[PDB]
Amino acid sequence: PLTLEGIKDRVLYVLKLYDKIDPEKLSVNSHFMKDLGLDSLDQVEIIMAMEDEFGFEIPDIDAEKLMCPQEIVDYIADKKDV
Amino acid sequence: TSVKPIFSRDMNEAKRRVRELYRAWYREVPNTVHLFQLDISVKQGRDKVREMFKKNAHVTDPRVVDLLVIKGKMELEETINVWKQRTHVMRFFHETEAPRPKDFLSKFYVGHDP
Amino acid sequence: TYKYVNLREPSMDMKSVTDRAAQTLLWTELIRGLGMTLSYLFREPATINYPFEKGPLSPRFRGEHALRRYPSGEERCIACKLCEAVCPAQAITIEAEPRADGSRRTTRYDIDMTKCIYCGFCQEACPVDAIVEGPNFEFSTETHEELLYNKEKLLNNGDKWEAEIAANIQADYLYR
Amino acid sequence: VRETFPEATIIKPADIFGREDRFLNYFANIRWFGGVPLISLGKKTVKQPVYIVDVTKGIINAIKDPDARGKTFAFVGPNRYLLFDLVQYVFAVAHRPFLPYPMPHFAYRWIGRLFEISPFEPWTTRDKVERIHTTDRTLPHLPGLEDLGVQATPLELKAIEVLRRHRTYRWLSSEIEDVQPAKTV
Amino acid sequence: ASATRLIQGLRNWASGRDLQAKLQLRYQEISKRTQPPPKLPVGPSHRLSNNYYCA
Amino acid sequence: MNLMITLLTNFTLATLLVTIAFWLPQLNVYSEKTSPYECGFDPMGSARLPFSMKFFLVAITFLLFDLEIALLLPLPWASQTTNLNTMLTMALLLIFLLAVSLAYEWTQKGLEWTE
Amino acid sequence: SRGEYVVAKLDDLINWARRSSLWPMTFGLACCAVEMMHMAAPRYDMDRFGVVFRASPRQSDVMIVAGTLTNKMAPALRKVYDQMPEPRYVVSMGSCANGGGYYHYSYSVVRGCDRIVPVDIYVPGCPPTAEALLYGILQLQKKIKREKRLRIWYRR
Amino acid sequence: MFMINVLTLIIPILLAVAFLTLVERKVLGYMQFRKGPNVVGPYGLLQPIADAIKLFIKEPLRPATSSISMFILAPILALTLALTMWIPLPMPYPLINMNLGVLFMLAMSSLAVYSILWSGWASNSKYALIGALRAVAQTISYEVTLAIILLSVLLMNGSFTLSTLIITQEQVWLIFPAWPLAMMWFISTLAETNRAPFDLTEGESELVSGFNVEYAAGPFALFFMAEYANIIMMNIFTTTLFLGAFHNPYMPELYTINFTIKSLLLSITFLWIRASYPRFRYDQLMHLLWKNFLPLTLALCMWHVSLPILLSSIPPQT
Amino acid sequence: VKQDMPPVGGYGPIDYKRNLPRRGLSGYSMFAVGIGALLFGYW
Ligand SMILES: CCCCCCCCCCCCCCCCCC(=O)OC[C@H](COP(=O)([O-])OCC[N+](C)(C)C)OC(=O)CCCCCCCCCCCCCCCCC
Ligand SMILES: CCCCCCCCCCCCCCCCCC(=O)OC[C@H](COP(=O)(O)OCCN)OC(=O)CCCCCCCCCCCCCCCCC
Ligand SMILES: CCCCCCCCCCCCCCCCCC(=O)OC[C@H](COP(=O)(O)OCCN)OC(=O)CCCCCCCCCCCCCCCCC
Ligand SMILES: CCCCCCCCCCCCCCCCCC(=O)OC[C@H](COP(=O)(O)OCCN)OC(=O)CCCCCCCCCCCCCCCCC
Ligand SMILES: CCCCCCCCCCC1=C(C)C(=O)C(OC)=C(OC)C1=O
Ligand SMILES: CCCCCCCCCCC1=C(C)C(=O)C(OC)=C(OC)C1=O
Ligand code: SF4
Ligand code: SF4
Ligand code: SF4
Known part of the structure; x- marks a missing residue:
């Protein structure tokens, strides 16, 4: 929560704890629907894993447009100081 | 073709409501396993919730998925409040039923149903 | 054409105030209730000594079903299925065919006593007084399938209880 | 039974567990007596307990199979456990204080005759001592639950x-x- | 109705009402269990003339 | 000495009526017969949750009125003294102070229950 | 043998104490419970037989299923029956508790309480009279009278 | 030969409890226009033996959520304190002649509440919790007059000795100078002993069984026989307080027969009140013993302190 | 004809009102009895 690097490493840590994503393909600019091949509900439980990690209620309109871990770490950086 | 909505103007608000309902079920399942003292894992109940959501995944009518969100919130209120019992929650897990014959050959062997 | 229950104002002279204060401090209506209960203590109770004494019944009473016969040995049921057409619970199942002398009789006459609602539409729909709902009510079983009567059980109920069913129909049949 | 009914299906269960068993309930109920005594710390015997609905589906699929006539089936659970960590997993699910101790073989049968002098259903016996401390043998030549279509739980x-x-x-x-979970072998 | 007049008087005093005049246990004052056979009347359409059903 | 024997006897054949109550019949224990009773349906939450006392001010003032029968209780003995008008004045002072306390607890609606 | 005589007389003692101290539970469902109250009424009077209600299942001996068992209450019926200590018995009163009854083909009715609990005495009627219910209770007492618990323990 | 005296005390006052169950059911039946038990024995005289054998051959059912130690200790302490409140009662001679037997009765009344109370807590159930805290609400209501009434009646006795209370009432009954105290003590003992109209702990209609709703047969027997031992002891105690009989030092059986039939009449009076009244709401219980009985009890305490001084009739303490 | 019918003069008059017969003493009599019992006990 202090620097952006810890946030990005923690995002990738939660996404490799997530089991339906194969971590070998998991890059920071990897997409979930067309690259990793996920359902929408997979991305929804990814966002709820992010709320289990970071601890702030993410609305629906700005979590729909979180289609890569880079967008996730950029949105957490927008909602924080860094 | 000019019909009156229930909650959703189109499929975007409808998918928003389906998404919020799946969020609420995903948050609810560990409490449902705990205080009903169900003998299933939390992943197993979450996969049952994913199966019950993917069962209705072919609907393209906003009014029908509005009613599905409505009935899902009703079942969620029956699950948060202890109004269901262990039987009503485990009825989504068809466990006493036999695996029905799937191919043509075993359905031919057991009976007359197509 | 209407009356006001509980619209009494109490009297406020010193006599009635002292009377209610004695009722409050000395518990008069409580002693009234104790007196009425003590009055029932010294009565004869209404307890009939079952199974030696029986509750009173009428000749209209609707109990166990029975298939009746004519006074020659011939059974009365001529397979016309009005009793299962009017049965409000579909307890009666009838299957029939002409028997060996060409007579219209039943091969199956089943009454499910655990669907039966004991309303007696079958005994009032029967044109020949074959099915009746007789006087027996003490026929509790220890297993469920003993309360699924076939034709043989119903004819044995008729042969068992005929000396009473004939008399009850003789007592009531002018009202029917 | 094999010689007087040659077409019989004879079924070998290992140690059946369920709600009304005398296997996991038995392992549970030595928090009453003491500190769950075990022959050689219960680490020289191996068990593979089978679930009761697996055995029941095996019996019914042996009824429905004409190829099960005259066979000899061995119904075992999927995992083999030592007796020590089997009892440790029993006491870890029930959250009881698990403090085992070695009892020798000549003295843990005297405890067996101490409870079979009752005229009721005995709490234990020396035969049950011998059979809790008998390893579940491996018979790969006999068919199992996988050959009747029963997935072992x-x-x-x-x-x-x-x-x-x-x-x-x-x-x-x-x-x-x-x-x-307990450690398999 | 088989009670002694001591118990009857105590019971009347305790209830405050006359109880032998209005007994709740029934005796020979009730109707007979065997009755004469009735002759029930018929309705207004049990006629042989001017009895067209459409009218 | 006799009191200890009598209490030991009462406790003994009150606990020998329990050890022949648990060990004499036949048990069929399963984890639904020992479930909590809530009139047939499963209980919502625990019965160890806070059960809010409505009568709490009366519950506190019972602790201040129960001391009075540790104070008013020597009055059968205090009547046996040789300074008796002083004793009578102090006794009526104690019951009067209890009564003034009860009057004050009435008039501020302290004997009523909350909600 | 002497021991067979002793366990026979002790069977007679425990069967006497269980059939002459039946405590049913305050549990009705439908119209049959009105008639079951009439079996408690001063004419038929269950209490002369030792038959008296206890509201808790822990302190009840028989469950008279008096009325219609629907689907919404069948788990409540099963948990109430489960919370009765052994020996516990079930008397099924009326047609809906026996076999579904007048609501047999309904979407919402359990077709007989014997799909849910083991049933000892089936009392037939819609409703059975309070005298017929008391007949079923006395037949249950006769069923308890011929139990052979300690004899079968002595022989096994 | 004192242990034989303890046994001949406490075994007949278990048989009296047993046949009080039959007397309760039959007097309750004839007051309800029905009969009580008459089938099991000759006119029901063997019904309590069937009930006593039945409850100890039925499965005991210790619950899953129950804190088991207090769950077992509650009926043990119930029947222990029910038996041991009979020992200072003069019959005309008490088992243990205490100089302060009244305070023993009062303190062992105060300890008997914890049987109900720990039974309601230990059996981890919601109705049992309601039945336990309704015992709290009932005990804080009756204890705030149970000691002042019993104080005001002994200001004519001189001590807390129950055996002296026979000598106190040798001329007149002590209900004649103290009938407001008597009619208030009687209701305070109804509310003490959890009998109707003050049931309120084993509430059949509000609760299911209240505190003993989880107690199956065997442990349930030791609350029920405890409650009936409490009511027989409490009517014997009320009889000793207000209806003390003639005592001949050479013929004790005359006094024994006399207080026996008086306490039996008060037991029938308890059964006859339980057969006739609706049940209080358990706050109206508290607004009775605090707002109605307690002011008048303080007034009668002033009067019964001042009146032996007023007439030079202070009783001796010896 | 024969039919279940009321008699020719009809049935008798039927009571249907409240009869709570107002028994007991008055207030002053019961307080006089109570105070007299108090005075006898005190003497
Ligand atoms: C022990 C031997 C037997 C003793 C007698 C008892 C047996 C009869 C029992 C009958 C059944 C009772 C069952 C429980 C009933 C519970 C209800 C109940 O009783 O409520 C109490 C009721 C309550 O009344 P309430 O509830 O209607 O009060 C309404 C209160 N407000 C207005 C605030 C809402 O009465 C009392 O509290 C009175 C207590 C006893 C009074 C005794 C007074 C004696 C006279 C003193 C002197 C008077 C003159 C003044 C001085 C003159 C000087 C010269
Ligand atoms: C000096 C003598 C000794 C006095 C001290 C010893 C007292 C012994 C008794 C102990 C009493 C303790 C509790 C007393 C509480 C009194 C206050 C009270 O309750 O006031 C409220 C009450 C009206 O009640 P309310 O407010 O409507 O309550 C609603 C819920 N019921 O208000 C009322 O009902 C009005 C109360 C005042 C008027 C009473 C008049 C009685 C007169 C009797 C004759 C004279 C006696 C001598 C004393 C002087 C009295 C003025
Ligand atoms: C302080 C006083 C306290 C008093 C406590 C007791 C009060 C009640 C006293 C007893 C009252 C009568 C009891 C009657 C019991 C049954 C009698 C009977 O008829 O039993 C018959 C039964 C079956 O026999 P069967 O062969 O069927 O008979 C066919 C007949 N041609 O055969 C049997 O039942 C077998 C025989 C059983 C006998 C049991 C008798 C009762 C025992 C009660 C215990 C207490 C006894 C007293 C102890 C203290 C005094 C000494
Ligand atoms: C974990 C939960 C609890 C589980 C275990 C429960 C055990 C039973 C609990 C209930 C009994 C508690 C007893 C408490 C002490 C009572 C003392 C007593 O009875 O005193 C009254 C009486 C007064 O008479 P007095 O004026 O002394 O006359 C003789 C002089 N002439 O005194 C006499 O007559 C004197 C006779 C000798 C007295 C000896 C001293 C008292 C012995 C106390 C034993 C232990 C008490 C334990 C209390 C546990 C409370 C829960
Ligand atoms: C104590 C007197 C006998 C009571 C017996 C009650 C047994 C259970 C019957 C169920 C029932 C209850 C409780 C009941 O209160 C009631 O209301 C009148 C019913 O009818 C709708 C019932 O069916
Ligand atoms: C040796 C001691 C024997 C004690 C027997 C206890 C069991 C008897 C309970 C009978 C009973 C009584 C007296 C009773 O008071 C009652 O209330 C009406 C009942 O029904 C709810 C009863 O079942
Ligand atoms: S009595 Fe009614 S329900 Fe029963 S068989 Fe006859 S018609 Fe059918
Ligand atoms: S109505 Fe009568 S004759 Fe006709 S089928 Fe039924 S029983 Fe037979
Ligand atoms: S069997 Fe019939 S009368 Fe009886 S409760 Fe059911 S519906 Fe009512």
């Missing part, structure tokens, strides 16, 4: 269902996943 799915009864209220509502 492991202990880590049904042990909570068996052993929720032996818990006290302070840990009565803990879940199936809130325990480390």
Whole structure:
């Protein structure tokens, strides 16, 4: 929560704890629907894993447009100081 | 073709409501396993919730998925409040039923149903 | 054409105030209730000594079903299925065919006593007084399938209880 | 039975567990007596316990199979466990204090004759001592549950269902996943 | 109705009402269990003339 | 000495009526017969949750009025003294102070229950 | 043998004490419970037989399923029956508790309480009279009278 | 030969409890226009033996959520304190002649509440919790007059000795100078002993069984026989307080027969009140013993302190 | 004809009102009895 690097490493840590994503393909600019091949509900439980990690209620309109871990770490950086 | 909505103007608000309902079920399942003292894992109940959501995944009518969100919130209120019992929650897990014959050959062997 | 229950104002002279204060401090209506209960203590109770004494019944009473016969040995049921057409619970199942002398009789006459609602539409729909709902009510079983009567059980109920069913129909049949 | 009915299906269960068993309930109920005594710390015997609905589906699929006539089936669970960590997993699901201790073979049969002098159903016997401390033999030549189409259920799915009864209220509502599984061999 | 007049008087005093005049246990004052056979009347359409059903 | 024997006897054949109550019949224990009773359906939450006392001010003032019968209780003995008008004045002072306390607890609606 | 005589007389003692101290539970469902109250009424009077209600299942001996068992209450019926200590018995009163009854083909009715609990005495009627219910209770007492618990323990 | 005296005390006052169950059911039946038990024995005289054998051959059912130690200790302490409140009662001679037997009765009344109370807590159930805290609400209501009434009646006795209370009432009954105290003590003992109209702990209609709703047979027997031992002891105690009989030092059986039939009449009076009244709401219980009985009890305490001084009739303490 | 019918003069008059017969003493009599019992006990 202090620097952006810890946030990005923690995002990738939660996404490799997530089991339906194969971590070998998991890059920071990897997409979930067309690259990793996920359902929408997979991305929804990814966002709820992010709320289990970071601890702030993410609305629906700005979590729909979180289609890569880079967008996730950029949105957490927008909602924080860094 | 000019019909009156229930909650959703189109499929975007409808998918928003389906998404919020799946969020609420995903948050609810560990409490449902705990205080009903169900003998299933939390992943197993979450996969049952994913199966019950993917069962209705072919609907393209906003009014029908509005009613599905409505009935899902009703079942969620029956699950948060202890109004269901262990039987009503485990009825989504068809466990006493036999695996029905799937191919043509075993359905031919057991009976007359197509 | 209407009356006001509980619209009494109490009297406020010193006599009635002292009377209610004695009722409050000395518990008069409580002693009234104790007196009425003590009055029932010294009565004869209404307890009939079952199974030696029986509750009173009428000749209209609707109990166990029975298939009746004519006074020659011939059974009365001529397979016309009005009793299962009017049965409000579909307890009666009838299957029939002409028997060996060409007579219209039943091969199956089943009454499910655990669907039966004991309303007696079958005994009032029967044109020949074959099915009746007789006087027996003490026929509790220890297993469920003993309360699924076939034709043989119903004819044995008729042969068992005929000396009473004939008399009850003789007592009531002018009202029917 | 094989010589007087040659077409009989003779079934070998290993050690059946369920709600009404005398296997996991037995392992539970030595928190009453003491500190669950075991021959040679219960680490020289191996068990592979089978679930009861697996055995029941095996019996019914042996009824429906004409190829099960004259066979000899061996119904075992999927995982083999030593007796030590089997009992440790039993006492870990029930959240009881597990403090085992070695009792020798000549003295743990005197405890066996101490409880079979009752005229009722005995709490234990020397035969049960011999059979808790008999290893489940491996017979690969006999067909099993996989040859009747019965998928064998492991202990880590049904042990909570068996052993929720032996818990006290302070840990009565803990879940199936809130325990480390036993070590297989 | 078989009670002694001591118990009868105590019971009347305790209830405050006259109880032998209005007994709740029934005796020979009730109707007979065997009755004469009735002759029930018929309705207004049990006629042989001017009885067209459409009218 | 006799009191200890009598209490030991009462406790003994009150606990020998329990040890022949648990060990004599036949048990069929399963984890639904020992479930909590909530009139047939499963209980919502625990019965160890806070059960809010409505009568709490009366519950506190019972602790201040129960001391009075540790104070008013020597009055059968205090009547046996040789300074008796002083004793009578102090006794009526104690019951009067209890009564003034009860009057004050009435008039501020302290004997009523909350909600 | 002497021991067979002793266990026979002790069977007679425990069967006497269980059939002459039946405590049913305050549990009705439908119209049959009105008639079951009439079996408690001063004419038929269950209490002369030792038959008296206890509201808790822990302190009840028989469950008279008096009325219609629907689907919404069948788990409540099963948990109430489970919370009765052994020996516990079930008397099924009326047609809906026996076999579904007048609501047999309904979407919402359990077709007989014997799909849910083991049933000892089936009392037939819609409703059975309070005298017929008391007949079923006395037949249950006769069923308890011929139990052979300690004899079968002595022989096994 | 004192242990034989303890046994001949406490075994007949278990048989009296047993046949009080039959007397309760039959007097309750004839007051309800029905009969009580008459089938099991000759006119029901063997019904309590069937009930006593039945409850100890039925499965005991210790619950899953129950804190088991207090769950077992509650009926043990119930029947222990029910038996041991009979020992200072003069019959005309008490088992243990205490100089302060009244305070023993009062303190062992105060300890008997914890049987109900720990039974309601230990059996981890919601109705049992309601039945336990309704016992709290009932005990804080009756204890705030149970000691002042019993104080004001002994200001004519001189001590807390129950055996002296026979000598106190040798001329007149002590209900004649103290009938407001008597009619208030009687209701305070109804509310003490959890009998109707003050049931309120084993509430059949509000609760299911209240505190003993989880107690199956065997442990349930030791609350029920405890409650009936409490009511027989409490009517014997009320009889000793207000209806003390003639005592001949050479013929004790005359006094024994006399207080026996008086306490039996008060037991029938308890059964006859339980057969006739609706049940209080358990706050109206508290607004009775605090707002109605307690002011008048303080007034009668002033009067019964001042009146032996007023007439030079202070009783001796010896 | 024969039919279940009321008699020719009809049935008798039927009571249907409240009869709570107002028994007991008055207030002053019961307080006089109570105070007299108090005075006898005190003497
Ligand atoms: C022990 C031997 C037997 C003793 C007698 C008892 C047996 C009869 C029992 C009958 C059944 C009772 C069952 C429980 C009933 C519970 C209800 C109940 O009783 O409520 C109490 C009721 C309550 O009344 P309430 O509830 O209607 O009060 C309404 C209160 N407000 C207005 C605030 C809402 O009465 C009392 O509290 C009175 C207590 C006893 C009074 C005794 C007074 C004696 C006279 C003193 C002197 C008077 C003159 C003044 C001085 C003159 C000087 C010269
Ligand atoms: C000096 C003598 C000794 C006095 C001290 C010893 C007292 C012994 C008794 C102990 C009493 C303790 C509790 C007393 C509480 C009194 C206050 C009270 O309750 O006031 C409220 C009451 C009206 O009640 P309310 O407010 O409507 O309550 C609603 C819920 N019921 O208000 C009322 O009902 C009005 C109360 C005042 C008027 C009473 C008049 C009685 C007169 C009797 C004759 C004279 C006696 C001598 C004393 C002087 C009295 C003025
Ligand atoms: C302080 C006083 C306290 C008093 C406590 C007791 C009060 C009640 C006293 C007893 C009252 C009568 C009891 C009657 C019992 C049954 C009698 C009877 O008829 O039993 C018959 C039964 C079956 O026999 P069967 O062969 O069927 O008979 C066919 C007949 N041609 O055969 C049997 O039942 C077998 C025989 C059993 C006998 C049991 C008798 C009762 C025992 C009660 C215990 C207490 C006894 C007293 C102890 C203290 C005094 C000494
Ligand atoms: C964990 C939960 C609890 C589980 C275990 C429960 C055990 C039973 C609990 C209930 C009994 C508690 C007893 C408490 C002490 C009572 C003392 C007593 O009875 O005193 C009254 C009486 C006064 O008479 P007095 O004026 O002394 O006359 C003789 C002089 N002429 O005194 C006499 O007559 C004197 C006779 C000798 C007295 C000896 C001293 C008292 C012995 C106390 C034993 C232990 C008490 C334990 C209390 C546990 C409370 C829960
Ligand atoms: C104590 C007197 C006998 C009571 C017996 C009650 C047994 C259970 C019957 C169920 C029932 C209850 C409780 C009941 O209160 C009631 O209301 C009148 C009913 O009818 C709708 C019932 O069916
Ligand atoms: C040796 C001691 C024997 C004690 C027997 C206890 C069991 C008897 C309970 C009978 C009973 C009584 C007296 C009773 O008071 C009652 O209330 C009406 C009942 O029904 C709810 C009863 O079942
Ligand atoms: S009595 Fe009614 S329900 Fe029964 S068989 Fe006859 S018609 Fe059918
Ligand atoms: S109505 Fe009568 S004759 Fe006709 S089928 Fe039924 S029983 Fe037979
Ligand atoms: S069997 Fe019939 S009368 Fe009886 S409760 Fe059911 S519906 Fe009512």
